[PDB]
Amino acid sequence: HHHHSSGVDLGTENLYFQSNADTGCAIDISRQELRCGSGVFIHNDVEAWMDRYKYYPETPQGLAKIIQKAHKEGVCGLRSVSRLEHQMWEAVKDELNTLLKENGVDLSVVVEKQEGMYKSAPKRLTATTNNTFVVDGPETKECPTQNRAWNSLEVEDFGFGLTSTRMFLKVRESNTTECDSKIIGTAVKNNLAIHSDLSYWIESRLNDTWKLERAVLGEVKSCTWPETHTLWGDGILESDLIIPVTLAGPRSNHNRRPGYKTQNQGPWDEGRVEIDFDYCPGTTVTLSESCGHRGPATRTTTESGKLITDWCCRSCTLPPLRYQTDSGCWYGMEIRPQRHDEKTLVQSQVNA
Amino acid sequence: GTENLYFQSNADTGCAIDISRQELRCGSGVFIHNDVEAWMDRYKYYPETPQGLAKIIQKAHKEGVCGLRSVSRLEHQMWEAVKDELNTLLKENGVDLSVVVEKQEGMYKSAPKRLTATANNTFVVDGPETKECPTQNRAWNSLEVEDFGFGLTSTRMFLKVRESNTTECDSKIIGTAVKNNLAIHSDLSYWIESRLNDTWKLERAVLGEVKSCTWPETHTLWGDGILESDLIIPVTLAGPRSNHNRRPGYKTQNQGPWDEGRVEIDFDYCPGTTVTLSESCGHRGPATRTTTESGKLITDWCCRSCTLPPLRYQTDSGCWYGMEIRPQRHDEKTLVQSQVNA
Numbered sequence: 305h306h307h308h309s310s311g312v313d314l315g316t317e318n319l320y321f322q323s324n325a326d327t328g329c330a331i332d333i334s335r336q337e338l339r340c341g342s343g344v345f346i347h348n349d350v351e352a353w354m355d356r357y358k359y360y361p362e363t364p365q366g367l368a369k370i371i372q373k374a375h376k377e378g379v380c381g382l383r384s385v386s387r388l389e390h391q392m393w394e395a396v397k398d399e400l401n402t403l404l405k406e407n408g409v410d411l412s413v414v415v416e417k418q419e420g421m422y423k424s425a426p427k428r429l430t431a432t433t434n435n436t437f438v439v440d441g442p443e444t445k446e447c448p449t450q451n452r453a454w455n456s457l458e459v460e461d462f463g464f465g466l467t468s469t470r471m472f473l474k475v476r477e478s479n480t481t482e483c484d485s486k487i488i489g490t491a492v493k494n495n496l497a498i499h500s501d502l503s504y505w506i507e508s509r510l511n512d513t514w515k516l517e518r519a520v521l522g523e524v525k526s527c528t529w530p531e532t533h534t535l536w537g538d539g540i541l542e543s544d545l546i547i548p549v550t551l552a553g554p555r556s557n558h559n560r561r562p563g564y565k566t567q568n569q570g571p572w573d574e575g576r577v578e579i580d581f582d583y584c585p586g587t588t589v590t591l592s593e594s595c596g597h598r599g600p601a602t603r604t605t606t607e608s609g610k611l612i613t614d615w616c617c618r619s620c621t622l623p624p625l626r627y628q629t630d631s632g633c634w635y636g637m638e639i640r641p642q643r644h645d646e647k648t649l650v651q652s653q654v655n656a
Numbered sequence: 657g658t659e660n661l662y663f664q665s666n667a668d669t670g671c672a673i674d675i676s677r678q679e680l681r682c683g684s685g686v687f688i689h690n691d692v693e694a695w696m697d698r699y700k701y702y703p704e705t706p707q708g709l710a711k712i713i714q715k716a717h718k719e720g721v722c723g724l725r726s727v728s729r730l731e732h733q734m735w736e737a738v739k740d741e742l743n744t745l746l747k748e749n750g751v752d753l754s755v756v757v758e759k760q761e762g763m764y765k766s767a768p769k770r771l772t773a774t775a776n777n778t779f780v781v782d783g784p785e786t787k788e789c790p791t792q793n794r795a796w797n798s799l800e801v802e803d804f805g806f807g808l809t810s811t812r813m814f815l816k817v818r819e820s821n822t823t824e825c826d827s828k829i830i831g832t833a834v835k836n837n838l839a840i841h842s843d844l845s846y847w848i849e850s851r852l853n854d855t856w857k858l859e860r861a862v863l864g865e866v867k868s869c870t871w872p873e874t875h876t877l878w879g880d881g882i883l884e885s886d887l888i889i890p891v892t893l894a895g896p897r898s899n900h901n902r903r904p905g906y907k908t909q910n911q912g913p914w915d916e917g918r919v920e921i922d923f924d925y926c927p928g929t930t931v932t933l934s935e936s937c938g939h940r941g942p943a944t945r946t947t948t949e950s951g952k953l954i955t956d957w958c959c960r961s962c963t964l965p966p967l968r969y970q971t972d973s974g975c976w977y978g979m980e981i982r983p984q985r986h987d988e989k990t991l992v993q994s995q996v997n998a
């Protein structure tokens with residue numbers, strides 16, 4: 305197989321340092337000090353201006369065979385777990401089609417644009433022992449999700465690069481809903497806590513209490529956050545978890561905010577989503593026992609583009625839970641417009 | 657944003673080599689480094705106010721608190737360094753009381769009383785257990801880090817008296833992280849490392865001291881569905897309630913050599929010894945040292961149903977084996993065994 309060549313790997317005899325820890329120097333801006341050593345270094349990659357990591361199959365040829373096998377067994381298509389996976393399919397389809405074509409296989413890979421959240425599917429690709437394979441796109445009768453594969457691939461090893469690293473995907477030996485743990489980084493230091501990977505950045509901090517402070521989701525996925533990489537996962541009420549478990553929300557008490565419950569009806573279908581606790585520009589939020597109950601997350605702008613100024617909440621805490629998306633700024637479920645006149649507002653239709 | 661301004665102002669910024677990711681990367685985030693194996697000399701405790709602390713003590717002394725037990729060596733060394741300053745203050749406020757701090761050899765044990773912010777004439781810190789000043793009348797875990805220093809004083813840590821009552825460890829000095837095939841539970845004296853080989857399991861631990869506080873759940877990984885019998889480092893000895901704190905074939909080392917000072921746990925053979933699986937072997941017992949009091953070597957060891965490599969302790973007085981690992985020869989040569997039972 306000529307699409308892959310390795311370099312140095314882990315098992316190489318390193319006399320200088322621990323090969324499976326991160327080794328370097330960093331400035332601790334709190335204490336204002338420079339420290340070198342070995343350990344675990346967690347970086348923010350969700351908010352990077354370009355992609356450091358890129359998926360590629362370990363063997364394109366092998367992957368083409370996995371697909372034609374799946375095609376024979378009734379698997380009409382596939383749904384990606386993440387934007388990065390989607391970009392791999394988008395980037396490798398012409399290569400796959402060539403493999404299939406030159407081997408006289410009546411099958412072509414079709415990958416459609418994915419705008420919303422990356423949803424789950426029941427089927428799985430497996431290793432070896434209509435004439436199209438559709439990746440993502442809208443939900444159709446021609447290729448329903450229930451016949452599509454999802455979360456069938458995981459990272460085997462990484463590829464060196466100068467301004468970007470390759471991640472090579474292999475076929476999973478098992479069936480899980482769990483996110484690939486190889487790309488997960490979780491850490492807590494100086495009472496600041498991070499649950500992260502290549503698309504989620506979830507930050508909780510101890511102010512007067514431990515609570516969620518900020519979250520950035522480059523996409524909204526449907527895999528499961530592993531317990532191995534989860535902080536504070538004892539005595540959990542899934543109702544209190546701000547980011548829903550079914551949306552790769554960490555089953556962690558860090559994933560909470562007093563006054564708030566599970567945002568099952570947040571704007572998850574908006575693409576990139578950023579959660580934090582501040583006021584939407586030009587709006588206000590006041591406590592009122594005479595306020596509406598939890599409902600779909602509402603955007604602070606109308607379909608026309610008019611601004612809803614006055615907002616209320618029954619029993620939440622301030623500052624309000626705020627979403628920021630491409631289409632504007634939204635408020636958490638427990639926060640409702642104060643005026644009952646619906647001006648044809650924009651609300652989430654997700655319910656997850 | 658607000659919380660994004662805070663992160664840049666309070667996070668770690670630098671570069672590191674990741675052989676796992678096969679990359680060299682710079683950036684901002686959170687860095688957990690190894691400090692137990694060198695840095696206990698560079699970070700140092702200071703009380704926020706000696707003066708305020710002297711008042712805190714004389715109050716507690718009046719309320720029947722005869723003395724104190726430190727949570728950690730770092731705390732112990734603070735007392736040792738600040739006693740002359742406190743005693744001077746006490747003298748100057750006409751208070752018939754002096755602080756006495758004794759050497760601490762064993763594990764740092766717990767105590768029920770607490771100092772608060774708002775008939776001997778001595779306040780005893782640590783030392784052996786006495787009837788003159790019993791543990792049950794001493795305070796413990798009354799302090800926490802208020803804040804850190806800066807630039808030149810970046811390695812200074814200023815302590816305040818706890819506003820609340822817990823058994824939990826000071827969380828401000830805790831670093832817990834997992835990335836690639838590595839998961840770390842650490843602070844200024846514990847380094848607890850688990851690795852993903854075929855499965856996630858404990859691989860190595862270094863304890864510069866053995867303390868008796870409780871590892872916070874907020875800084876605990878994989879703390880769901882815990883069987884405490886399976887936790888290698890005992891919960892009562894600041895062991896993390898984590899499934900990372902496990903090793904297939906082994907149960908809680910309640911009778912390990914915790915009273916020896918520095919302890920290093922890992923899974924390798926003691927030099928000159930061997931370990932074999934045998935159903936005709938002894939059941940779990942106190943951890944045994946591979947050398948006798950005389951200085952003779954035990955070579956042959958057995959275990960009933962554990963996994964190899966064996967659980968190994970390393971202390972100043974030598975190398976020991978896990979509770980489930982017993983000498984194969986039944987002739988007792990007067991062995992050196994742990995007497996802790998925790």
Ligand SMILES: *[C@@H]1O[C@H](CO)[C@@H](O[C@@H]2O[C@H](CO)[C@@H](O[C@@H]3O[C@H](CO[C@H]4O[C@H](CO)[C@@H](O)[C@H](O)[C@@H]4O)[C@@H](O)[C@H](O[C@H]4O[C@H](CO)[C@@H](O)[C@H](O)[C@@H]4O)[C@@H]3O)[C@H](O)[C@H]2NC(C)=O)[C@H](O)[C@H]1NC(C)=O
Nearest residue numbers: 509510511512513517581588589590591622623658659662
């Ligand atoms: C880290 O965590 C700390 C504490 O957990 C936070 O500190 C608090 O921040 C809030 C937000 O500003 C403060 O609340 C404000 O208090 C002002 C004064 O308090 C009134 O009420 C008290 C009763 O306790 C009286 O004693 C006092 O005399 C005042 O009458 C108010 O003026 C503020 O009101 C504003 O917002 C309300 C919201 O409805 C409006 O109705 C008002 O018109 C006005 O616009 C607000 O209530 C609180 O005082 C702070 N406490 C402390 C101890 O500092 C930090 O904010 C937090 N930091 C981060 C980054 O998260």
Ligand SMILES: *[C@@H]1O[C@H](CO)[C@@H](O[C@@H]2O[C@H](CO)[C@@H](O)[C@H](O)[C@H]2NC(C)=O)[C@H](O)[C@H]1NC(C)=O
Nearest residue numbers: 424425426427428429430450451478479480481
């Ligand atoms: C792999 O596991 C998943 C989850 O355990 C299975 O998903 C279920 O599949 C059935 C129909 O196939 C659906 O009705 C359920 O709703 C699914 N549960 C979910 C999505 O949580 C899946 O069937 C398994 N597939 C294989 C090939 O093992």
Ligand SMILES: *[C@@H]1O[C@H](CO)[C@@H](O[C@@H]2O[C@H](CO)[C@@H](O)[C@H](O)[C@H]2NC(C)=O)[C@H](O)[C@H]1NC(C)=O
Nearest residue numbers: 756758775776777778779780781786787788789
């Ligand atoms: C009051 O406290 C002092 C200091 O702790 C006690 O003096 C020591 O007591 C121990 C107890 O066995 C002796 O071993 C030491 O030799 C004593 N001196 C020193 C310098 O440590 C004293 O006994 C206490 N008096 C009481 C309880 O009545």
Ligand SMILES: *[C@@H]1O[C@H](CO)[C@@H](O[C@@H]2O[C@H](CO)[C@@H](O)[C@H](O)[C@H]2NC(C)=O)[C@H](O)[C@H]1NC(C)=O
Nearest residue numbers: 314315324851852853854855859923924964965
């Ligand atoms: C990771 O686990 C594997 C077993 O799953 C270890 O492999 C064994 O290594 C020992 C000595 O290194 C050999 O005697 C065995 O034959 C190996 N077994 C197999 C199945 O290969 C491996 O050593 C572990 N890695 C580390 C770093 O401890």
Ligand SMILES: *[C@@H]1O[C@H](CO)[C@@H](O)[C@H](O)[C@H]1NC(C)=O
Nearest residue numbers: 768769770771820821822823
């Ligand atoms: C400290 O708190 C614990 C928590 O239950 C309690 O049992 C104990 O009595 C308290 N001690 C003091 C001195 O307040």
